[PDB]
Every structure is written in C-alpha cells, then in structure tokens.
Amino acid sequence: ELVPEARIAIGHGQMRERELERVMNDFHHQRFNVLVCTTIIETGIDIPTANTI
DNA sequence: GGGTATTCGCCGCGTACCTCTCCTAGCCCGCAAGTATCCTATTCCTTGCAGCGGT
Secondary structure, X not given: OOOOOOOEEEEOOOOOHHHHHHXXXXXXXXXXXXXXXXXXXXXXXXXXXXXOX
C-alpha cells in the first residue's frame, strides 16, 4: 500500500521449501522488484540487479 | 530590695596483674552471570479426499 508501484513478495526459511525456492527463482527472473525478506539473504546471495537494501 | 530558703546541676568516688571477644549501616554501581525471540539443520507424527481393484 505504501508503494503501489512495486511488486512485492515474501521470502524466509520458515515456509515450505517448494514455495521459498520458487519465490527466490522468480526474484532472479525480475518477476518482482521488492522482496520483503528475513536475514536469510545475509549470507551472500548475489543477485547483481539488486542495488538497494 | 533583701535576707532567706529551696532547687538544680556539677564534681568526686584504690592499686597491680591475668584471660577472653569485638571495633557501622546501608546504598549503589558496575561486574557479570544467567535468560526470551529469529533463521537453517534435525526427529515427531496425525488427517482428507480421490484412485482403484474387484466383483
């Protein structure tokens, strides 16, 4: 609601594997810009196109 | 005023030696030591509805 222009998904390790895997795969293919994420992305996930945290 | 009486408060009460115990209460502040929520692995199982042989 704050930013209607953005496409938002949710990614964390406490949801089912077939869902988190597909969500992360979609994020690679630019299917959405913002990804509300937990600290699971603190370990060195590259995703070069992402340049604002 | 004053001579008298009455009260009040201060000062004082032996030497020498031996044994023993015990010498502030409480607060604060920082050390440090022991605890409730968040992700990625693990062992723990108990239901719901469609196929499906088989007759």
